[PDB]
Amino acid sequence: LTTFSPTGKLVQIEYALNRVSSSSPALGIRAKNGVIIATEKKSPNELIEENSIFKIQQISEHIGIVYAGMPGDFRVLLKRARKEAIRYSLQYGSEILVKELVKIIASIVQEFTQTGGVRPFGLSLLICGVDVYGYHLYQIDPSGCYFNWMATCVGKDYQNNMSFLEKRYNKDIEIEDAIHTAILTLKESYEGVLNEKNIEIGVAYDNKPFKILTQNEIKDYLIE
Template sequence: MQGQTQQQAYDRGITIFSPDGRLYQVEYAREAVKRGTPSIGVRTDDGVVLLVDKRISSPLMEEASVEKIHKADDHIGIASAGHVADARQLIDFARRDAQINRVRYDEPIGVETLTKDITDHIQQYTQVGGARPFGVALLIGGVTGGEPRLFETDPSGTPYEWKAIAIGENRSTVQEYLEENYDETLPLDEGVELALRALGEIRDELSPEGVGVGTIDAETGAFLELSNDEIQEYLSDLALLEDETADEEATPDSDGDEETEE
């Protein structure tokens, strides 16, 4: 009971360390990320893939209103997991930072530079009173000098670089699949397939409307968001479409145990 009282005393202020060196509000922000729908990033020799699970909660919801993947600059895309409103604030910061760099230096901002600018901004909200930490993690993918880069941001303000990474709900399951199946030599389209298969590990049904995919090609250095038709083609090739899953379950086996009606 005394331990709970002590924790409550320290988790009310983000600027106060607990006696064991913890910032409880930052840890709570990480929990918010874990409750968010997953996002996946895959870096290949040919570019970077960003995939998000939109999870449309109602057929009456407009698909375009679910924003989890964003264009930060011509050569950089960002995916999020956690509080979408917090993500939008960081996306706006990233876009302003990228444009300022173009105006000031007449060149596109580096992916690592942008990531560290964002994480510096996030870190300020872990040591300044009167505001809470951002309850969101970002995947920042892009191309710098023809080299694909992929970074993750943490609510503490720490950047990490990855070859393949999952954030959000069921992260450990998706990450385990990526670790077992990732290959640096994958072409970009197979990177998309890997990300979709990884999401399929935790989703029984996938639809083009419920998935967002963005790619940054190393050769062109351009961010491109795939259309629903293109996503549907990938899902169909991988047998991950929700209607195809239902059809396979309804198909009689080779022994003819099920009767069909004409």
């Protein structure tokens, strides 16, 4: 029942976009030999074990996802994302393409806007992964649209967070060199200067299966 407005814009969608504009910052940057993703994990205390609460989940052996909104919604969209990675894998024996997968999740998010008595999704996705047509890094909007980004951020204060990427990014960057330009876009962007194994980073890892980098592995890059 999220109807229109006299100005010609959905008001519930604009309200939903404010929720992703005030959550933890998610950041993905593509490269020429893989795609990387990062998320500022706001650790509230030492009681929450890091191996339970995560911001980087998998869809298949080559698809990575990132969350940027309502934590309670970080699982329902994941269940239908993995289900679509299975329904395509049952009929078609090969792997699910990212463009074929993102167009289905965008259709699922869309149906939660036109249906009566429902609420739009309070999150922004970041689907990334190795494909047979190169690499990809898409971003799903609560409105239902999707963009074929190259390097983007969706969390809190992204108007100036993207400014680091508009001036410190080249078309031909390796995945190992893109890690430090991503950490700089997190530590040197805003508060959270005590970045000591409090950042989750997933990579495509040059056509190998999706690898979730461990805390001590990121520590090698956290020294700079």
